[PDB]
Amino acid sequence: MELKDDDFEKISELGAGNGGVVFKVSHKPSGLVMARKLIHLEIKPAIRNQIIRELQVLHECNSPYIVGFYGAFYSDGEISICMEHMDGGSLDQVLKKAGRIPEQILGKVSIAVIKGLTYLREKHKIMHRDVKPSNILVNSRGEIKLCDFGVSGQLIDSMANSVGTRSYMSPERLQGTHYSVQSDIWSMGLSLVEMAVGRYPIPPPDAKELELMFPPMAIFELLDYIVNEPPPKLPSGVFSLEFQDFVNKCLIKNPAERADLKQLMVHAFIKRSDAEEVDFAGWLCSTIGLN
Template sequence: MSSGKRRNPLGLSLPPTVNENSESGDGVADEAPSQAPIEDQLKKLGLTEPQKQRLNEWLQVKEGIQDLSEDMLRNEGELGHGNGGVVHKVMHKVKNVVMARKLVHLEVKPSVRQQIVKELSVLHKCNSPYIVGFYGAFIDNNDISICMEYMDGLSLDIVMKKAGRLPEKFVGRISVAVVRGLTYLKDEIKILHRDVKPSNMLVNSNGEIKLCDFGVSGMLIDSMANSFVGTRSYMAPERLTGSHYTIQSDIWSFGLSLIELLIGRYPVPAPTKAEYAQIFGLQESEIELADGRTDAPEYQTSNTPAAMAIFEMLDYIVNEPPPTLPKKVFSEETIAFLSKCVKKVPGERATLKALSTDPFFTKYADVDDHGEFAAFVTKTIDIPRPV
C-alpha cells in the first residue's frame, strides 16, 4: 500500500478486542462453564446420526491423547498463518493422529503464558460438529502451541482463491454451519467468536464446515493485539467507532464473509457495476444492484481492496453504504438474507434466531446434498483419496 494513501479523516482508532463489559454472552470465558454429560449435550444439539458418529469417533481419538509436548509431535508442513501465529500439520508420534498445531510466539511473562493456557482449556468443553475440535495446548519456551482437529480442506479463503468464487448452494450450506456454530458458542459456551471471516471457517473432505480461532482467551487476544489488522477489516461499523462488541458485530462479519465467498473478493470497497459485469460475464447494463443505488461509489483514488490503506478501508466501512449484490445474478432469498446481516445500525441486523428461521437458511438446513460439497472441496484442494 502506498504510504501516501494512509488517511484517517475520521480519526478512527484500532479498538481493543476484549475486556469489555456488555450484554450477556459477550464476555470471554475465564473458566469452562459446567456442562451436562456429553451424551446429553449431543442429544440437545439435535444432530444427525452421521454427525453424532463422526463427533463420537473424534472424541474417542481425543481421549487417547492426554499430555502434549513438543517431543510428541512431528512437523509435516506449514498450513498457513493465523492471527499472530503459524499453523502446521503435525503428527502425534505415539498415537499416529494428525493435528493442526498453531504456534504463537509471545514475549510475555511466564505467568501470562500459563494464564493463556488456562483460559484455552475451555475449548475442551466445545463438542459441536460446527466447531473445530481441541486436543490441548502447551508451552515451550516463549511459544504456545494450540493443537486442533486437522481439517484437510483447509480454510474457505484458500478454497475461494482456488475456485474463484463459491456457488450459491455451497454458501447456503456454509451459512447453516456458521449460524449454528455461533449459536453454540453463545448459548452453550457463553462466548462470542469476535473474528468471523473466511480464513476462520475450515472445511474437510467429509463436507463439514467448522469455526476456529474464536476469542476464548482474552489475555491471548490482548497479547497479540498488534497483529489483528486482518481482523479489523471484518469488524462492524460500530466497533470502529468505539462501541462495545455484541453478537450483532459477529453477524456483520458473517454477512461480509458470505458476500466475499459469493463474489470472489473482499467486498470493500463495494464492486461497481462494471466490476460485477466482468465477474459474472454480463453486460454492465444488465447489472441492477439490489438496494436500488445506481452504482457503487468511487472512493478516493482506491477502488480495489489491495489499493486501500487500512484507515481508508475502515473509513469506508463506517461512512459508505454496506455492500450489496446484483439482482438476477443471485436469488432474492440470498440477497435478503445477506442484507439483514450487513445493516449499518446494529439494532437493525438480524439476530441468530431470526437467521435460523430465514427462508435462505431453511432452504439448506438439514438437506442431504449427497456429498456434492464434499466432492467440491476434495477436488478444489486436491485432497488425496485414501488408498
Template sequence: MSNRGNNQSRNKFNLKIQAVPQLDPIPDKQTATDETDMAAVREKLADLQISPTEREQLEDFLKHKKELPVLSSSDLEQMSVLGSGNSGVVTKVKHTRTNIVMARKMIHLEVKPAIILQILRELKILHSCNSPYIVGFWGAFQAENEINICMEYMNGGSLDLIMRKSGRIHENVLARISLGVLKGLKYLRDEKAIIHRDVKPSNILVNTKGDIKLCDFGVSGQLINSMANSFVGTRSYMSPERLQGTKYNIVSDIWSYGLSLIEMAYGKYPIPPPSEEDMEELMSATGPVYPSSRASTNRGDSVDDNSPKTLAIFELLDYIVNEPPPTLPAKYFTETFIEFVNKCLVKDPKDRATLTFLMSHQFVTSDKVISLEDFISWITKHGIDNETN
C-alpha cells in the same frame, strides 16, 4: 466514497484500532469443566440438537482425546505447512505416539512468562467446547516463547484457502456453509456465553465428511491483547459498532459473517465495491481472479495486489463506519440470498438480523441448498487435500 485529500481527512472521524472494545455483559459460563468422564460427556451431548452421526463422531474424538498423552513438541512430527500470517504458523502434524493427525498453530509472543501461563489457563475453556460445528481442541502447551494450540485437523481446509484455489463460491454451497456457521455461533452463545469476535473465511473450516466448523474464537482476553498489533486484517470484518469502540454483542458476529458471505460470493473482499466491469470479470471467472492476493488476510493494509482498488487501513475503517454497507447485485444473485446478506449488514445493531431469524431464513432452509453428498464432492475437489481426517 468521497475523495479524502490527506491523512487527517482520511481519518476525520478519529477511528481507532482498539485492542479489545467493551463487551456487553454476559453470564459467566466460561469455567472449564472436567470432560474426562465419558458418561458425563454423553449426557451433555444428549442435550444438544445434533444427529446420531454427529454425536458418534464427537464421542469418538473425545475418547481419543482422553487417551492422549500430555502434548509436547517432541511428539509432533510436521507433515506440511497449512498457512501462515501475522498471528503465527499453522502446520499439519502427526502425534507420533498415537498417529493422530492434528493442526498445530504456533503463536510467537514476546510477553512475560506469567502472561503465557494465564493464556494457557484461559484456553482450557476449549476443552469443554464440544459441538459438531466447533473445531475440536486437543490441547495447548508452551514451547519457549510460543503458544502451541493443537486442534482437530480439517482436511478441506479453510474457506479462504479454498477461494484461493477455486475462486468464488456458489450461493447454494454458501447456504449449507451458512447453516453450519450459524449453528456454531448459536452453540458458543447458548452453551458457553462466548462471542466469536473473529468471523471470517479463514476461520471457517471444512472436511471431506461434510463438516463445517468454526475456529479461533476469542476465549482468551490475554491472547487477544498480546496479539492486538497482528490483527490489522481482522479489523476489516468488524462491525461499525466495534470499530467505534462501543459495546457489542453476538450481532457483531452476524455483520462479520455477512461481509464474509459477499467476499466468498465474489471471490474477493467487497470493500470498496467493485465497478460493473470488475463485477462482470468476477462473475465470469472460473477460478481465482486475483491469485496473487492473499484471501481474507490483512485486508485494509496498503497491499500491492492485482485488485483494481485498495484502501489504506483507516480509509477502509472509515468506509465501513460511514458509507453504505456492500450489497449483492440482483443481476448475479437470487433475491433470497441478497435479502439474507442485507439483513446481516445493517449498520444499527438493534435492527440487524438475529441468529434465530437467519436460521429459519429461506436461504438456508430451501431445497436449493446443496446436498451433503454434493457438498462433500465439492470439498474433495477444492479442499487442501483428499485424505480422510
C-alpha cells in the same frame, strides 16, 4: 493423554498468519495427525500461565460445527494450540482455487456458521470475535467448522496490538467498545459476500466490473468507507432473492436493528438451504483436487 512438545513431529506447514504459524504435525505417541498452531508471545510467564489455563475450556467445546481441540501448552517462547487437522483447509483457501463459491454451497456454509456461533453462545456464553473466510475450516468428510474464536480473555488482550488492511470488523466495533455478539453477524455477512463475489467486498464492484465477473485502499480510506458509506450489497439477478435478503439482514449498520442468530436461523434462505440436497464433499474435493 497430555500433550507435550517433544512428542510431536513436523510434517509440513499448513499456513501462517499475522498471529501465528500452524503446522501439520504428527503426535508420535498416538500416531494421530494434528494441526499445531504456534503463537509467539513475548510476555511474562505468569500471564502465559493464565492463557494456557483459559485455553483449557477448549476441551469443553465439543460440536460438529466447531474445530476439534486436543490440547494447549507452552513450549519455548510460544504457546501451542493443537487441533483437528481439516484436510480441506480454510474457506479463503478454497475461495482462491474456486475463484468463487456457489450460492448452494454458501447456504450450507451459512448453516454451519450460524449453528457454530449459536453453540458458542448458548453453551459457553462467548462470541467469536474473528469470523472471516480463513477461520472457517472444511474437510473431505463435508464438515464445516469454525475456529479461532475468543475463548481466552487474556489472549485477546495480548493480541490487542496486532490487524491487516482488509477488515471484517463491524462498524460499531471499529468505532468503539460498544459492540458484542451482533458484531459476528456483520462479519459473517461480509464473508459471505466475499465468497459469493470472489474478492473482498469493499469497495464494491462497479457495473462494468460485475459484467466481467459474471489498487488497495489506504488504511483510513477503507475503514471510513465501512463506517460511513452504505454496506456492500449482493449483485441482483445472478443471486437468489432470498440470499440477497439474508446478507442484507446481516449487513445492517445498526447492531440493534441487525438480524441476530435466532432470526437468521429461521430465515427463508436457511430454510431453503436446509432442505436442499447438496454434495459439499464432492464439490470441495473436486474444486481443490483432494478426493
